[PDB]
């Protein structure tokens, strides 16, 4: 029995250094999806394994001038390695020189967006259809109208000492009733008071129709918002920015892409400023978090899902997968270990083992959980959050009324 | 009651006259950015804008109200708004009416036999309010154009009280004229 | 040489010119296009061939022989199968598969969520039940507060007249009386302000309800499909999909299998056409579980009545097959990739599913439209009316008999 | 001086047989754009011409098996012709064997649609937001409510012989005022009448809000209609059908087209049923006229404009030109007449002569005229045509009121 | 061999890598791409060359020599000019042009029609002046008819109270009195019905005015540009466009030339950049007349502030040029067509104008948005209010002085 | 007046009773197309549809009201509408109430001393209208589904008059009870 080398890589969550690895030793020093996969593979095939990280710390690439393979591929070709359990994207250049098993995880490019917030409507949001200046000028105009009505109804002794009921208090009451399209017990009988009432009525009509119409526009527009659901939506629109990781093969896929959509996205990508691209995927994540929904990163599906279940869960995978690829297990050319490895990967795939491990390391360790994530009421009916301020106003007015009733009782009694 | 109702009227007119003249000639109305600064903070007014930070600080310059544009002498409504806004005649008219009304009230403590003097003052105090609330709609509608953020100062609210006080003393002056007439009939 | 294949749209479907044109041009499909580039890369000659027996491939539990298309390759009847054959353990032991040229998974099929028949009491839809419930308590609260104010601190405004004043204020109608005190007037104003917002809010949101159609699917996943019980779901009576739920140990898919066998009537069907019709006839009460490719193809064919919802429950793929010990094995393994990075397979995917698509490929083909409100829309408020009148006469006779006594 | 052959073709309006050609003879037998062009060309070059129609009656084509040129091209190559003034689209095959002048008219493929009608809103269109059944049930419910109110207010002697003012007539008045959100001089005092009034008020509120909201939806939807303005709009949408002439080179342009848009249109074209294509351009014209805006023909710009100024002008050219081509004058290879012809065509082009002739034969002979055709108010403000029925109702009600006043006077007097 | 050219975007513009890369790759543009396929068809070698002198070509009225790019070809300094050279009589006599590879015409340039500053009395916009005018006559008509009915056939309803009843009915406010006769009640009902439609119509259409932005250009042609006088229009001081209007004998373009010379201030400019800015600054009061290609290019460049409106006033084209007696003459004449039918020139047209387009190439890039109503929107009804109050006090004193007498 | 007011009441009830029973049992309500014909023209009704042209002409078949669908016994509101629409209890109830009311009126010409008999008849005539107008909302709301064209016949309008007449005789019967009571008090 000869132990076989594995040559993982420390990318998250495929392999992780444990919480306190200093006291631990051997293969128990590590954990991850790939580690449990290697355990299952060793169990099925019937060998014993000793894990390892590549010193270089990379997956694989052909040095053009040196004509050398780096990373795990190099460790496989040059006899330093017998297996490679880490995520190795299946490519033409890699498959030429080493043998890949059938894929244990299929994936592709996907869109990552800042998660829409709860969007709490806020108290006193029913005032939004009209500006603050309009409301305050309404108040001041109401005062002016009431005073003018009181004047032109209680200035003439010829109808005063005899008469009009339009004092200041009843005038304010009349104006307030008029503004709300509610009649009052009185109405002007003179020409002056009637002119005042009519023009105030016109003002009221225009203002209320404006409020209702603008509110309808608000709710209609907020209802027709179509969230991004695909790449063609990003291609057609240009308001929201989007970029990739320039170091990786994502830009290698976009520069070469021949479909009209992805060609359009590529033309947008390099033309824009200051930099839609970002040096590191963590930087793209935190940029999308900071951009306030104005930037959409493009990323492998697996890391998008992983980030979607790590605090702060202010991110979301959206749409399907633009392409289709597969991570796979690699072995050197002509190795006796190819067949058992491939058959064991498939046997696990028909069983729920790979799905179980994925659900374990992406969702069961979800810091923010799932709870059927992304679900919503999906109802446009107005809610008590929208119109809470007017209920609060009603309660305050009733309390003030009771207080003033107490004061009136005290004043009248003594 | 008790006959000090006239004292409140003339006290209100004198204060309401100051709170309007001081409001006009104080230029702490608006708080916004206009690119004159180097835009940068301002504490503008009816006549002169004035930067607040940067190298230009404590230096106040007249507001134009007529930057070179085709709308000058072309748009009938827009030009007329800009004529009245530049002149600020409506706020200036409001302080005049309060002044005349206060004089009539003070000229009614003497010549105490007459009553129609007070009716004039009550109307002027009321007409001051209409000019005032016209003088603020013009100012607000003029400032707008076409997500910038602005704020209103404390000279703005000084003009607001002059509306409230003026409308109050219009009520009291009328109530005086009512009370005086009944004593005479 | 011998390209064994089976006929299933869009992979292979007989061309309209089946008779006058013979051989390679006789057949057409996604696989038919593909074998050209495979042979272009390799160079080998090929002739279109159909498997005589419609089965894909499997070993009998007793005879232990391979039927269908794979049985051709095991026994040397052919040398390649450019066809939709799933990669599986039992098939890998005996023949050598390629790498996956199209990834796959089980999916969900539903009827398109149509504009539902409008229900009675649909006029309440613009405002949630929380608002309607809290309107009533405020109506009670205001009428009570007007009574206490008017009795404890009078200048009639009893309880019965206060409930009338508040109601007439809510409907913008003319109050027979008005408060004459300050405390009664403060209550009226805030109630008056309260109504003005609420009536406009109802009228405003309703204009959105009618101007814009926004239909949301009942489900977006399989968790939502197992928890509920109103909607049904089934698979073919004989297929891997039934097997996948049978052997599954995940809690959600084990939960489904309890439902599927405990079916009254049977959820299962004999062929995919039965499941398509059952979805097209159940009016959103059936959800057919199948592969992600038929669902995508069917979604783009007429009558354009269904959609694929949710993600994929399983991951699997189709792979080109060659016999054990074929010189063709490594080129095809190296060719499908060369197409895959190049993006050829994506273009064919668009060609046979989305392009040449009868449904327009997007909602932009459809346009908004309006309809005059019908009696069904507002029949709930006629019933409420006629119900109130019968109550009014009923209450009056009670007053009559009481007043007589 | 040797007279030169011209070999026109009778396509409209380039050459037309005169209204009564039997008495006329020679070149005066014909008229058209091409005839006046040939007159100007002869004047500039300094020769004398004798017009002719091709016996075959076609422009030009290569017989594949026979390897023969047909039509005007054949008459030019085989010495039967010295000039060709007719519209000959410049092509590669034609230019190989004969010499083309510079183009005297540039054109391309364009979209032809049924002209939108005036769309008279119609009297009694303000009732459209609510169905006929709703209005009539409102009437019948108003009657029922009035009768029930009259009953429960005038059934009890304990309040009758003493009382309530709610007779049948005042009850109808109260219900009518309630439905219109206008108060009346009376209001119920009993519990029964108050229940009736409240529920009728609720009915009124719901119905009026429904009317206003549905009307707003109607006007908003009718405002967001985007008419077709390009080919990409037809490519994206599929509600409106569109096709070409199958005989001609338009389908030759579409079958071969490699741009994504026109490829999409070509895929739609042959797939559809029963036949988007049409045998003859007149058939396509009258089909689009009959289709009621549901079919869009694709046609050369010139014939589209020509049809747009012939009665019945129920057609319109829409959008720009999909491609760019040019009609041109042809001469046989090596002819001495090439240079003067080309220079004269250009000299006319810098002058306004060709534009003048086009305006003459397309617009000045416009049966339906132009009047700056296609102009509109482009205002969404409601017009008196929309709400004429309610004014008519008002007038009828006033007349009925005066008539009933006369009847009341006659009844009261005697 | 010697491909004479001039630099003008997108036909030829210096590449960013002007220094490190030299020769053919130094330059780029629409013409740069084109010369590759011309030389691919012909096969001849070519080197990118720029005309030393910026003029295109013309003959001095005294010296009679050809300047600029054409002067290179006449005097044998080069053999081809793949460049944007218009086909014209004076240029054809001395050199042999190709067929047109891009058709052309004079066009119109305007600022994009922006959301205008809202005017006072904009609240009347939902209803045309015909409706407002006919509302008043009906208000007069109803009030009169109520007076005649109530006096001739009484059971107060004078003229002054009838005008009050009708006004209070139009505003949904509580009438102090109600008719008590049948004839007076028939008048009230139809007036009440009339208002209910009108108020809802105002409120409904306003919701469309705010929900949807629909901006229509002031003009769509040149007829609409000559009739009016509010908007101005100009051309370059030295160019064919001024000449074209000068020699034109058509009535419409002769009408323009009267305006253009009688310009106060001058409509003309010294360069196209001046005309672009004047359009970008006049706020829709200037309309620059230029060629259809710069307008199409500028329309697709930032800040994306302008558009090309209307058709084309003239027809002309750009053509490849060769000297008199060049063996290259017939291939290029046969190559541009070969590109034209195949559709290459369309693809380059899309490449350099629409694709690589900063403005999104369609209105779909923009999205609808709302704004809370500001005092400027509804300042007209505050002025009407405060105007009415001053009238009311004024009328009262007139009553006072009259009543005193 | 003149005491023939009772004759109009009982005449109206008997006619309003016929115009409703005839309306129910006549099946010329609707005019539409339903694909039973071979869709083709029909003159449908409350119970039985009946083709009008084609090979199937003059042959009338019962309407189902329960085609095989999942909504059967599943949708609470839809099923209940279909129960009442199938039974047509509300129109059938309306004719019963008119019959009882007419009997009470005819039983009030005799027993002429009593007055509360007439009040019952007036209420029944009124309650007939509410059942009637309920019986048509159900019928209309049931016919709708999900641009076809329909039309309403003359048995429909026969039910309409029974509403108008029933509401009229409810007014007269009440007016009789009012007039009778005043004579007794
Ligand atoms: O000269 C001046 N007159 C005025 C009248 C009112 C106000 C005002 C106040 Cl006091 C509070 C809040 C907003 C205000 O401005 C408004 F117009 F109402 F929007 C300011 C004024 N200044
Ligand atoms: C009753 C006093 C007169 C007031 C009523 C005015 C009636 C105006 C009705 C005009 C309707 C207009 C119909 C033609 C449509 C149009 O103008 O284009």
């Amino acid at each position: 029995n000869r132990t076989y080398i594995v040559t993982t890589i420390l990318e998250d969550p495929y392999v992780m250094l444990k919480k306190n690895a200093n006291q631990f030793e051997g293969n128990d020093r590590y954990e991850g999806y790939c580690v449990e996969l290697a355990a299952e593979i060793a169990k099925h095939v019937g060998y014993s394994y000793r894990l390892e990280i590549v010193s270089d710390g990379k997956y694989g690439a052909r040095d053009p001038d040196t004509k050398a393979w780096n990373g795990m591929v190099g460790e496989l070709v040059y006899g330093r390695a017998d297996v490679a359990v880490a995520p190795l994207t299946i490519t033409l250049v890699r498959e030429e020189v080493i043998d890949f098993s059938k894929p244990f995880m299929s994936l592709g490019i996907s869109i990552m967006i800042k998660k829409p917030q709860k969007s709490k409507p806020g108290v006193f949001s029913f005032l939004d259809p009209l500006a603050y200046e309009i409301w305050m000028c309404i108040v001041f105009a109401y005062i002016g109208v009431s005073v003018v009505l009181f004047l032109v109804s209680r200035f003439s002794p010829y109808e005063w000492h005899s008469s009009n009921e339009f004092g200041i208090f009843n005038s304010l009451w009349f104006s307030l009733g008029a503004f709300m399209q509610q009649g009052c017990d009185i109405s002007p009988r003179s020409l002056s008071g009637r002119i005042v009432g009519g023009v105030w009525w016109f003002f009221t009509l225009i203002i209320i129709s404006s409020y209702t119409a603008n509110l309808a526009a608000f709710l209609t527009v907020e209802r027709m918002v179509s969230p991004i659901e695909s790449a063609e939506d990003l291609a057609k629109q240009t308001e929201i920015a989007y970029g990739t990781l320039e170091a990786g093969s994502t830009k290698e896929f976009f520069r070469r892409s021949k479909i009209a959509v992805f060609e359009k996205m590529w033309t947008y990508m390099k033309s824009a400023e200051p930099s839609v691209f970002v040096r590191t995927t963590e930087e793209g994540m935190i940029r999308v978090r900071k951009s306030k929904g104005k930037y959409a990163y493009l990323l492998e599906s697996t890391m998008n899902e992983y980030i979607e279940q790590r605090k702060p869960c202010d991110t979301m995978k959206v749409g399907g997968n633009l392409d289709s690829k597969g991570y796979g297990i690699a072995t050197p050319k002509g190795s006796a270990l190819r067949g058992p490895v491939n058959l064991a990967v498939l046997k696990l795939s028909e069983q729920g083992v790979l799905d179980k491990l994925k659900s374990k390391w992406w969702y069961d360790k979800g810091e923010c959980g799932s709870k059927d994530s992304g679900s919503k009421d999906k109802t446009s009916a107005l809610s008590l959050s929208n119109v809470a301020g007017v209920f609060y106003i009603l309660i305050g007015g009733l309390g003030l009324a009771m207080l003033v009733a107490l004061i009136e009782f005290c004043y009248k009694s003594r | 009651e008790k006959g000090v109702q006239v004292l409140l009227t003339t006290i209100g007119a004198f204060a309401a006259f100051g709170l309007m003249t001081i409001a006009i000639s104080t230029d702490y109305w608006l708080y916004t950015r206009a690119l004159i600064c180097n835009g940068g903070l301002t504490h503008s007014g009816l006549w002169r804008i004035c930067c607040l930070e940067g190298l230009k600080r404590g230096v106040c310059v007249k507001i134009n109200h007529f930057p070179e544009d085709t709308d000058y002498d072309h748009d009938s409504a827009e030009y007329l708004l800009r004529v009245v806004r530049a002149s600020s005649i409506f706020p200036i008219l409001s302080a005049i009416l309060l002044l005349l009304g206060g004089v009539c009230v003070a000229a009614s403590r003497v010549y105490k036999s007459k009553r129609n003097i007070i009716l004039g003052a009550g109307i002027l105090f009321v007409a001051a309010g209409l000019s005032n609330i016209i003088g603020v709609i013009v100012y607000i509608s003029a400032n707008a154009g076409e997500k910038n953020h602005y704020s209103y100062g404390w000279s703005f609210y000084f003009g607001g009280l002059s509306f409230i006080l003026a409308e109050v003393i219009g009520v009291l002056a009328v109530n005086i004229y009512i009370e005086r007439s009944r004593e005479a009939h | 040489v011998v390209v064994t294949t089976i006929l299933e749209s869009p992979y292979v479907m007989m061309k309209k010119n089946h008779e006058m044109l013979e051989g390679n041009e006789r057949y057409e499909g996604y696989c038919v296009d593909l074998a050209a580039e495979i042979a272009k890369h390799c160079g080998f000659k090929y002739k279109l061939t159909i498997v005589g027996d419609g089965k894909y491939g499997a070993r009998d539990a007793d005879t232990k022989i391979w039927n269908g298309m794979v049985g051709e390759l095991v026994y040397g009847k052919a040398d390649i199968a450019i066809a939709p054959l799933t990669i599986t353990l039992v098939r890998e032991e005996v023949i050598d598969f390629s790498k996956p040229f199209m990834s796959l998974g089980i999916s969900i099929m539903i009827k398109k969520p149509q504009k539902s028949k409008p229900g009675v009491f649909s006029f309440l839809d613009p405002l949630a039940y929380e608002i309607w419930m809290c309107i009533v308590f405020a109506y009670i609260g205001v009428s009570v507060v007007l009574f206490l104010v008017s009795r404890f601190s009078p200048y009639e405004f009893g309880i019965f007249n206060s409930l009338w004043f508040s109601l007439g204020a809510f409907m913008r109608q003319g109050c027979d009386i008005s408060p004459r005190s300050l405390s009664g007037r403060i209550v009226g104003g805030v109630w008056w302000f309260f109504t003005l917002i609420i009536i406009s809010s109802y009228t405003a949101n309703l204009a959105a309800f009618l101007t814009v159609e926004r239909m949301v699917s009942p489900i977006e996943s399989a968790e939502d499909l197992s928890k509920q019980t109103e909607i049904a779901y089934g698979t073919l009576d004989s297929g891997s999909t039934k097997e996948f739920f049978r052997r599954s140990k995940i809690a959600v898919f084990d939960k489904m299998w309890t439902y599927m066998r405990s079916a009254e009537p049977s959820v299962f069907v004999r062929t995919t056409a039965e499941g398509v019709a059952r979805v097209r006839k159940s009016k959103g009460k059936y959800a057919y579980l199948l592969e992600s490719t038929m669902n995508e193809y069917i979604e783009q064919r007429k009558p354009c009545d269904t959609m694929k919802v949710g993600g994929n429950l399983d991951s699997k793929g189709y792979g080109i097959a060659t016999p054990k010990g074929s010189s063709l094995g490594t080129p095809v393994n190296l060719a499908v990739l060369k197409l895959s990075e190049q993006g050829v397979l994506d273009k064919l995917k668009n060609k046979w599913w989305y392009d040449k698509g009868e449904c327009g490929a997007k909602d932009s083909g459809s346009k908004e439209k309006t309809s005059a409100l019908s009696l069904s829309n507002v029949a709930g408020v006629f019933y409420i009316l006629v119900g109130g009148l019968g109550l009014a006469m009923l209450v009056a006779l009670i007053e009559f008999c009481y007043k007589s006594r």
Side-chain angles (χ1 to χ4, degrees), chain A residues 90-92 95-96 100-103 106 126 169-170 173 176-177 180-183 185 208 211-212 215-216 219-220 223-224 256 258-259 322 342-343 346-347 349-350 355 379-384 387 390-391 393-394 397-398 401-402 404-405 408-409, chain C residues 87-89 92 97-100 103 125-128 131 134 138 142 145 149 152-153 168-169 172-173 175 178-179 181-183 185-187 189-194 196-197 200-201 204-205 208-209 212 214 216 247 314-315 333-334 337-338 341-342 346-347:
Chain A
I90 281 167
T91 53
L92 194 71
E95 180 57 280
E96 279 165 6
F100 276 118
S101 81
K102 294 276 170 265
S106 306
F126 60 88
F169 185 34
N170 300 278
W173 185 237
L176 182 77
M180 313 273 191
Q181 307 270 65
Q182 302 283 2
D185 63 358
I208 286 153
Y211 175 90
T212 299
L215 184 65
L219 304 182
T220 302
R223 192 182 179 194
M224 307 184 308
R256 173 175 61 68
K258 294 192 221 83
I259 302 96
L322 272 53
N342 205 20
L343 297 171
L346 295 182
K347 193 201 185 98
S349 191
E350 280 56 66
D355 307 348
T379 185
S380 42
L382 267 172
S383 303
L384 208 59
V387 298
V390 68
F391 284 103
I393 281 155
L394 174 72
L398 294 177
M402 291 205 258
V404 170
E408 275 199 305
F409 182 76
Chain C
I87 299 163
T88 314
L89 177 55
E92 198 77 30
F97 272 95
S98 161
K99 254 68 190 189
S103 278
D125 289 339
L127 260 53
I131 289 159
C134 294
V142 164
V145 171
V149 162
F152 293 179
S153 163
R172 321 295 280 294
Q173 294 288 349
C175 55
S178 62
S181 47
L182 182 64
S183 47
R185 280 173 170 181
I186 285 154
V187 172
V190 301
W191 185 238
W192 286 354
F193 184 65
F194 170 89
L196 183 63
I197 307 310
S200 305
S201 291
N205 201 346
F209 274 47
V212 172
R214 198 181 73 175
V216 307
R247 58 160 145 80
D314 195 351
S315 293
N333 199 312
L334 267 293
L337 310 183
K338 181 72 102 182
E341 292 83 4
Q342 274 202 262
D346 274 305
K347 288 184 189 288

Side-chain angles (χ1 to χ4, degrees), chain B residues 33-67 73-74 77-108 110-111 113-114 116-145 148-156:
Chain B
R33 307 172 168 278
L35 311 167
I36 311 313
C37 310
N38 63 7
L41 313 189
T42 61
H43 54 63
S44 166
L46 277 178
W47 313 102
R48 60 186 85 83
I49 191 167
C50 190
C51 293
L52 181 51
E53 51 76 20
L55 287 159
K56 285 196 298 309
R57 174 174 212 165
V59 298
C60 309
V61 63
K62 190 187 80 61
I63 311 188
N64 189 358
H65 318 122
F66 285 98
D73 297 331
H74 201 300
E78 192 67 30
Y79 179 56
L80 196 56
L81 178 81
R82 289 158 73 85
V83 165
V84 303
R85 168 57 185 91
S87 63
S88 290
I89 189 66
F90 281 116
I92 283 155
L93 196 68
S94 167
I96 289 158
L97 300 183
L98 299 168
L99 180 61
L100 300 172
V103 165
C104 281
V105 160
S108 165
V110 177
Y111 304 71
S113 87
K114 317 282 289 244
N116 282 1
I117 287 162
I118 289 278
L119 190 83
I123 286 153
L124 294 189
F125 297 149
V126 163
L130 311 196
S131 296
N132 177 282
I133 199 75
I134 287 281
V136 73
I137 294 165
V138 161
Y139 172 85
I140 290 156
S141 310
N143 284 356
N148 207 354
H149 160 260
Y150 52 80
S151 163
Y152 287 117
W154 50 266
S155 280
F156 201 61

Side-chain angles (χ1 to χ4, degrees), chain A residues 219-251 253-262 264-285:
Chain A
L219 304 182
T220 302
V221 162
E222 292 292 272
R223 192 182 179 194
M224 307 184 308
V225 302
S226 291
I228 288 281
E229 296 144 49
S230 289
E232 53 263 26
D233 301 334
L234 290 167
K236 295 164 152 194
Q237 75 97 47
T238 188
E239 181 260 307
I240 297 161
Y242 58 93
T244 62
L245 193 73
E246 56 264 45
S249 76
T250 308
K251 180 164 68 162
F253 168 75
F254 264 109
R255 68 167 68 267
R256 173 175 61 68
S257 51
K258 294 192 221 83
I259 302 96
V261 178
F262 307 115
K264 204 208 299 305
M265 311 175 68
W266 175 228
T267 60
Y268 164 64
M269 220 76 88
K270 65 196 179 288
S271 315
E273 279 82 36
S275 77
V276 292
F277 297 82
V278 74
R279 284 311 301 151
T280 303
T281 186
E282 280 74 10
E283 306 276 40
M285 182 179 72

Side-chain angles (χ1 to χ4, degrees), chain C residues 205-218:
Chain C
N205 201 346
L206 188 74
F209 274 47
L210 308 180
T211 298
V212 172
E213 211 166 339
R214 198 181 73 175
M215 300 167 283
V216 307
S217 60

